[PDB]
Design a protein around this ligand. Structure first.
Ligand SMILES: [Cu+2]
Length: 398
């Protein structure tokens, strides 16, 4: 099934007066435009940054021209175009899904606008209320029907009712160990486990929203506790994307350095190293992705032996293991990758990469009922100018 998108082109009164169709063909996008009611001659036609066609001037809410192709309308006011472009894409870091197509007046004012909507793939966005939320980790409590997601900027955990979308503050951030929230997991007791980023902490909250414990790691320079996972053996394993160590938290809540990575094939370098982590359901292995190198690693829980599984996942962030299928959020690339794993988890093949309906720095993944949810963290905009509202996006497995 090809990657394609459609934009229903509206005029200022909100009437749909045309359509633009986009079909990905390798590196190029085939574009077809049909629109009526325009003045004869050549018209500027550009992608703008936001997928909104409401006033901001008419169509001002579309924002500026998207930069990281002229429409000719005959005497009857009908504009017709058909070309292939290598300057746009429906996927990757510069993909145009959920942006807008705007037609201008001169070869000028904005005369037509349409939101570019992915064909054949339904999604549900859950908007968050704050100006700097930067939701990073996500987890789901199926018994309560609540999605939890945490702010990488200030540590607040929001609870989202998965059916209604209603957002509440599960626990405000700011306390010791609670100033940053990255990877999240819900354990069988309904407790929320929270990776603490540069605080070097792992925090645990009970389902009432109260803190149970803040666990510290050793004080050494540049801690960055990134993500964690509960293995079948009952232990949590915790990645640090800056310090070459994997931590373990046992059932009694004792945190230890479990594997020193120096001298293993995992070589830490500049940037984000191990971050997403998963546990195989047979209890034999951890899988962890190294973002900066793009390498996926298998770690034997009994011997601590390390094996490379595959390469090609640069910018790989959160992991979600579903049998022999591994989903990998690739944050800069704005896609969710799908990996098929061998039976001993010793090799893998990258089989698909989904841009969904447009993603802004997707960071982590969780299962919600029969679906998946991904955070649009926009972490590349932290301290800068993110698009608001921040959102989580729920979508079918693939
Ligand atoms: Cu423009």
């Amino acid at each position: 099934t090809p990657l394609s998108a459609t934009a229903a082109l509206r005029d200022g009164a909100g009437q749909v007066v045309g359509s633009a169709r986009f079909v990905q063909q390798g590196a190029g996008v085939q574009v077809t435009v049909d629109v009526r009611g325009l003045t004869p001659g050549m018209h500027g036609m550009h992608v703008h940054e936001f997928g909104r066609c409401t006033p901001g001037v008419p169509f001002g809410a579309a924002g500026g021209h998207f930069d990281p192709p002229m429409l000719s309308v005959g005497a009857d006011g009908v504009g017709k175009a058909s070309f292939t472009s290598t300057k746009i894409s429906l996927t990757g870091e510069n993909g145009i899904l959920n942006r807008s197509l705007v037609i201008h007046a001169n070869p000028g004012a904005r005369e037509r606008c349409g939101v570019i909507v992915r064909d054949g793939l339904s999604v549900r966005d859950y908007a968050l209320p704050g100006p700097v939320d930067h939701p990073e980790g996500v987890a789901y409590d199926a018994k309560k029907g609540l999605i939890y997601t945490g702010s990488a900027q200030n540590g607040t955990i929001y609870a989202i009712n998965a059916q209604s979308g209603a957002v509440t503050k599960f626990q405000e951030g700011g306390a010791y160990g609670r100033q940053v929230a990255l990877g999240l997991k819900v354990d069988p007791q309904g407790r929320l486990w929270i990776a603490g980023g540069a605080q070097g902490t792992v925090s645990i909250l009970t389902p009432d929203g109260m803190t149970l414990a803040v666990l510290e790691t050793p004080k050494s320079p540049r801690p960055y506790i990134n993500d964690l996972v509960l293995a079948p053996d009952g232990n949590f394993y915790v990645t640090d994307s800056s310090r070459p160590v994997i931590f373990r938290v046992d059932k009694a809540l004792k945190l230890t350095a479990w594997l020193d990575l120096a001298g293993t094939p995992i070589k830490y370098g500049p940037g984000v190293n191990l971050n997403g982590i998963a546990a195989t359901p047979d209890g034999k292995y951890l899988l962890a992705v190294q973002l900066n190198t793009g390498e996926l690693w298998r770690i034997d829980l009994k011997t601590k032996a390390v094996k490379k599984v595959m390469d090609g996942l640069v910018n790989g962030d959160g992991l979600l293991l579903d049998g022999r299928t591994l989903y990998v959020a690739r944050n800069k690339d704005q896609v969710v990758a799908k990996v098929s794993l061998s039976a001993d988890y010793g090799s893998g093949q990258l089989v698909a990469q989904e841009p969904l309906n447009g993603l802004r720095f997707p960071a982590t993944l969780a299962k919600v009922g029969n679906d998946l949810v991904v955070t649009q963290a926009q972490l590349d905009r932290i301290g800068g100018t993110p698009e608001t509202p921040f959102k989580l996006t729920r979508f079918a497995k693939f």
